[PDB]
Amino acid sequence: GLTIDLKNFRKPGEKTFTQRSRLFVGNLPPDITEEEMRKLFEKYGKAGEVFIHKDKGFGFIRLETRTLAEIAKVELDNMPLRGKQLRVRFACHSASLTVRNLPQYVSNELLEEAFSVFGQVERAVVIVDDRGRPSGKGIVEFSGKPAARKALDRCSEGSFLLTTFPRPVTVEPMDQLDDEEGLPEKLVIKNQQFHKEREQPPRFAQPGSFEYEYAMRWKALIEMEKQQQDQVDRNIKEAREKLEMEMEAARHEHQVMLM
Amino acid sequence: EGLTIDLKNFRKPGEKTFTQRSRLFVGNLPPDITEEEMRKLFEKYGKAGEVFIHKDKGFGFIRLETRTLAEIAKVELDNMPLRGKQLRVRFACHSASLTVRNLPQYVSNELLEEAFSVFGQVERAVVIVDDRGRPSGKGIVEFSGKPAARKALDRCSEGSFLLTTFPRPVTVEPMDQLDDEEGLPEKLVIKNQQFHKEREQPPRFAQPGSFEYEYAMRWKALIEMEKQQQDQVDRNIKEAREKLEMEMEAARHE
Ligand code: PRO
Numbered sequence: 477g478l479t480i481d482l483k484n485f486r487k488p489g490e491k492t493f494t495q496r497s498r499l500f501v502g503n504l505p506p507d508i509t510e511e512e513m514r515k516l517f518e519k520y521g522k523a524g525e526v527f528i529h530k531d532k533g534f535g536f537i538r539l540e541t542r543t544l545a546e547i548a549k550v551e552l553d554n555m556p557l558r559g560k561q562l563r564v565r566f567a568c569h570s571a572s573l574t575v576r577n578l579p580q581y582v583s584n585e586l587l588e589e590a591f592s593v594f595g596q597v598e599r600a601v602v603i604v605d606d607r608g609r610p611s612g613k614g615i616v617e618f619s620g621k622p623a624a625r626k627a628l629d630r631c632s633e634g635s636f637l638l639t640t641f642p643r644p645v646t647v648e649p650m651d652q653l654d655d656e657e658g659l660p661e662k663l664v665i666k667n668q669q670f671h672k673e674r675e676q677p678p679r680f681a682q683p684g685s686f687e688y689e690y691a692m693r694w695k696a697l698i699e700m701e702k703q704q705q706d707q708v709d710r711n712i713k714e715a716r717e718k719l720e721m722e723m724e725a726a727r728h729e730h731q732v733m734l735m
Numbered sequence: 736e737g738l739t740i741d742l743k744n745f746r747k748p749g750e751k752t753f754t755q756r757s758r759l760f761v762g763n764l765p766p767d768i769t770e771e772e773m774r775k776l777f778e779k780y781g782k783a784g785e786v787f788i789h790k791d792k793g794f795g796f797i798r799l800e801t802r803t804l805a806e807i808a809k810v811e812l813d814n815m816p817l818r819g820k821q822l823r824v825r826f827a828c829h830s831a832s833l834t835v836r837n838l839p840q841y842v843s844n845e846l847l848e849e850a851f852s853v854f855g856q857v858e859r860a861v862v863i864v865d866d867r868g869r870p871s872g873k874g875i876v877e878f879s880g881k882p883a884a885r886k887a888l889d890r891c892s893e894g895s896f897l898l899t900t901f902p903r904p905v906t907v908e909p910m911d912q913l914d915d916e917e918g919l920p921e922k923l924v925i926k927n928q929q930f931h932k933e934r935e936q937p938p939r940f941a942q943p944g945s946f947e948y949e950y951a952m953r954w955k956a957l958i959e960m961e962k963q964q965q966d967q968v969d970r971n972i973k974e975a976r977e978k979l980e981m982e983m984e985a986a987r988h989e
């Protein structure tokens with residue numbers, strides 16, 4: 477129990493009522509109403525979309541900002557409602573893309589401006605490392621799936637160039653991984669394979685056991701896989717640096733007559 | 736006055752308190768900053784643990800109770816004006832975060848936590864999962880301190896750490912900390928002559944007949960070659976793994 481007066485809950489540049497502030501509400505009573513749902517989230521300010529599935533015991537609600545949705549999720553997840561324990565989660569984004577091979581001088585804003593040609597962009601991010609250096613990867617989140625499908629189609633058919641550098645970007649669907657809730661023990665199916673696997677507890681393979689032989693063979697195979705992958709990485713880097721040099725030398729031949 | 740919420744739940748189930756996940760960095764502090772003044776700024780975000788203010792540097796650290804409370808404090812206090820300075824409120828960089836790969840099957844967040852607790856005190860352990868709840872085979876292990884993570888990093892490379900009955904050890908590596916939240920704002924880009932040379936041409940599609948069309952087509956071909964190369968490596972690795980397992984099964988006697 478703690479009361480907080482929220483003065484700043486919208487992040488700089490954050491658009492409101494996006495799919496990033498959309499919550500999934502599951503294990504609802506079969507008789508749930510739109511008004512019941514709205515009352516449940518009343519405390520978390522303004523509400524946008526409220527959708528309840530006609531028969532399936534789940535719905536969606538859009539809150540104003542990520543902060544408000546994060547607070548509502550923590551407070552309302554596992555909340556008892558008429559014999560049911562509610563499941564409140566962030567809704568899976570229907571229109572999120574991974575952008576690879578980003579050139580230099582691409583800002584979040586430029587990424588948004590670039591992809592805004594395909595439809596309404598909710599968010600665009602140029603991913604940076606622990607020293608603020610761009611990784612070469614980015615995220616583009618559209619408001620709807622048709623706009624994301626347009627971007628995917630157009631960027632595979634054509635060569636989408638964000639800057640002067642003649643290297644097109646790669647646009648793929650976002651691989652959505654949950655690194656927050658993960659795999660709780662309760663949700664693991666306790667079948668025959670489960671019990672077979674849990675016979676032995678976490679340990680280090682001890683010399684003189686059947687498993688030590690096999691685990692050492694597995695370690696050797698993993699080291700072989702590392703060597704194989706390192707060679708492919710080196711070949712690709714070399715091939716890319718060759719092409720990137722030709723691209724840089726041919727670009728520095730554009731403004732020759734422009735200026 | 737803003738939006739007032741009587742918070743009744745700010746701790747996630749199983750969440751440990753005052754961890755590095757709830758630890759915040761506070762830069763651009765005014766020179767006349769005190770521990771009491773710092774505590775009063777964060778007073779509204781509940782109980783505070785560790786409060787550290789650097790000897791002279793004008794930065795500090797504050798541990799809040801939970802990740803939710805730290806997320807609220809960060810959003811509220813970041814880029815706030817205080818004594819002519821605009822505060823920089825960020826999550827403290829995690830000093831003891833690991834990526835576990837080659838996770839066997841039937842590993843849960845709790846099993847991963849029991850397993851890594853042998854090297855030291857575990858803040859959080861997560862089995863990463865996709866959009867259907869199937870495990871990715873990657874996980875996260877966050878320790879309270881750096882020595883526990885270095886211990887796990889060394890031990891798992893020297894030896895074969897097996898989580899289940901399957902005799903395949905897990906791969907432990909430092910966590911690659913990437914920011915997919917703040918990213919690269921236009922404000923942080925130095926608008927020099929190279930900047931303008933790069934932004935001379937706007938986002939567009941390379942048109943046939945242009946020199947850019949020829950280079951983009953060469954790049955597309957190179958990417959397709961890389962995909963073919965990677966697909967072959969993936970196939971070889973899978974085949975090799977399946978082969979090793981079949982040899983082990985043939986060897987096996989109940
Ligand atoms: O992922 C694998 O290859 C095996 C299956 C059971 C335990 N781990």
Ligand SMILES: [Cl-]
Nearest residue numbers: 760825826828
């Ligand atoms: Cl930082």
Ligand SMILES: [K+]
Nearest residue numbers: 585586589921
């Ligand atoms: K711009």
Ligand SMILES: [K+]
Nearest residue numbers: 661845846849
């Ligand atoms: K367990």
